[PDB]
Amino acid sequence: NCTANILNINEVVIATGCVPAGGNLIIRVGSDHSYLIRATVSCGLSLNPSQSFINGESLASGGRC
C-alpha cells in the first residue's frame, strides 16, 4: 500500500496514514482537522478536490505500509 504523511507550514510531520493502491483514505491530523488523501494505481499521493490544504499544511511521502 501507499503511505501518506501530512505536515504543517514548518514541514513538520503531524499526521500519517495509509492510502490503498487505486483507492483513497481519510487521514486525521492533530491540528484539529483532517485531510483526505488518495493514491493512484501506481501509488501517487494526492489531495481530494472537495478539500484543500490550509494553515500552511502540506503532503509528503513515507516509505512502506
TrEMBL record:
Disulfide pairings: 2-43, 18-65
Annotated ToxB-like N-terminal ascomycota domain residues: 2-59
Domain of life from the UniProt record: Eukaryota
Keywords: Signal
Residues forming coiled coils: none
Protein name in the entry: Toxb
Species per Swiss-Prot/TrEMBL record: Pyrenophora tritici-repentis
